[PDB]
Structure 1
Amino acid sequence: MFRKLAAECFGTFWLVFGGCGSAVLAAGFPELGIGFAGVALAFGLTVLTMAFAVGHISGGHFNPAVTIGLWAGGRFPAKEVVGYVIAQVVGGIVAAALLYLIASGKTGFDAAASGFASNGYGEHSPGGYSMLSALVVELVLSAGFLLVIHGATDKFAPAGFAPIAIGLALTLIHLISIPVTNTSVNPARSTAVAIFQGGWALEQLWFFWVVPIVGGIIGGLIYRTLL
């Protein structure tokens, strides 16, 4: 079990660190920044790379909504669920913790305002998208993400390619909804950075818990049911 939890912690820690890291440290860098499309890749890679390395230990979740989604899909044990979620959330915090430290080594940093790569909606959305839009897009993408995970993990799917699917799947998702909610689909990755924003990010933090979980559950049931 430990292995499983450690796998899930470093996994997520890696997700956040690389994800919000590129987000914070390189995304809008003066002239050579990696923009949204860079951050999009980054995130996916944290999952593509971590899935290979430790996926074979836990399940390569690194996401609460993926742990809960795989559950509603009949793939994951309801017993081990909670642990997995804590582990993911803990790893994420430890990540944003260092990230924050690292980000401070530069003049002008500020977790608040900058948002510390926190997710939000309306007035707190990158594009200024309505909460509703943030709801619709998060849902579809969360559902679709589990829909792809269950598919790439289905015993009839090209074995060993799963990580690539799931990985790049997250890159896709980002390329899509950054302007809306700065992309979440992961209540662990959203909590981690909110903690260090400690403002609106924490107020809307709930949103990025219910919404992703619900959608992942739909994605799971959609696969368990219609396949």
Structure 2
Amino acid sequence: EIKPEDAPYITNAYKPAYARWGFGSDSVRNHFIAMSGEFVGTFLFLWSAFVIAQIANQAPETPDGGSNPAQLIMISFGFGFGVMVGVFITYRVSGGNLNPAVTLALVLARAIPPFRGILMAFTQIVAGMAAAGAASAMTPGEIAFANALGGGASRTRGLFLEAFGTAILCLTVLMLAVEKHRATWFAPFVIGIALLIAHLICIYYTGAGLNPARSFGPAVAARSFPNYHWIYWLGPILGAFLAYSIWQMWKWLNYQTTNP
């Protein structure tokens, strides 16, 4: 027997909001709810992570262009744990996308409809601008959290790094959050670890975009766009399409069932 006072804890699924956006979803109320979750979540994630990167980039310079593992770990924690917290907070509000590339994968998977998806992506972009301006104002010194190529990487290598890192993130969302099972509630944790490793892959070489809202906001705030800024848009878009493609193949194959 479950006592009545325990029942909500046992019966109420901790499921992404988009799983329950059916008929009735096109109200102004419901669009505002989704937008508010994406705004709050994206702001808190990116603001946190930008300040952490600002601090980490005050570490003494490493000679000869070498890497600084502790620095890279710190920045990776700021984005990976930051997104973890943001998605846990907003999971039942908006689904915690916090990333236009994530929303695009979800639109392709027909988890989120296109108009709602556009509203969410524009909200994420505005939140990233706001986060960049707030982190800039709140920290001494010049902005140190904008994306740039490093570590000898070319534009072409950077594009592929960005695309594969984004694919890992998006495939995690699809398999854990979109698919419906007893680990869906835990997806925010796995999404955070995916982003953590994508930052360990990419910071040194690309600064780790993985998220057009993350790359755009600091560029506006610093009034500085490298000519290669397009990699931070195309790379994540290609990663979203790659992840979708793999998910769609497995859905076509009815992966979860031995004997369909």
Same-fold status (TM-score > 0.5): yes
Partners of 2:216 and 2:194 in 1: how far apart? 21
* Residue of structure 1 in register with 2:109 after alignment: 73
* Residue of structure 2 in register with 1:87 after alignment: 123
* Residue of structure 2 in register with 1:4 after alignment: 34
* Residue of structure 1 in register with 2:163 after alignment: 139
Which protein has greater RCO, CA pairs closer than 8 Å, 6+ apart?
A: 1
CA deviations 1:57-87 (Å, max 9, x no partner) are 1111000000011111222211201110111
Partners of 1:198 and 1:171 in 2: how far apart? 28
> What's the secondary structure of 1:221's corresponding residue?
helix
The answer to whether the 8 Å contact 2:45/2:83 transfers is yes
Distance 1:15 1:34, change over 3 A: farther
What RMSD in Å do the two structures reach over aligned CA positions?
A: 1.9
Partners of 2:182 and 2:58 in 1: how far apart? 38
Report the CA distance between 1:88 and its aligned residue.
0.4
* Residue of structure 2 in register with 1:55 after alignment: 91
Report the CA distance between 1:218 and its aligned residue.
1.8
* Residue of structure 1 in register with 2:180 after alignment: 155
Report the CA distance between 1:27 and its aligned residue.
4.0
> What's the secondary structure of 2:156's corresponding residue?
helix
Q: Residue 165 of structure 1 aligns to which amino acid in structure 2?
A: V
The answer to whether the 8 Å contact 1:71/1:78 transfers is yes
Whether 2:62 is the aligned partner of 1:26: answer no
Q: TM-score, normalized by length of structure 1?
A: 0.87
Stretches of 4+ aligned residues off by more than 4 angstroms: none
Higher helix share: 1
Point out where structure 2 has 5 or more consecutive residues left out of the alignment: 1-30, 62-68, 252-260
Question: Aligned to 1:110, which of 142, 157, 180?
Answer: 142
Partners of 2:88 and 2:95 in 1: how far apart? 10
Q: Residue 146 of structure 1 aligns to which amino acid in structure 2?
A: C
Whether 2:154 is the aligned partner of 1:130: answer yes
Whether 2:38 is the aligned partner of 1:13: answer no
CA deviations 1:11-61 (Å, max 9, x no partner) are 111121111211112344459x96111110110111111111112111110
- For the pair shown, which has the larger CA radius of gyration, 1 or 2? 2
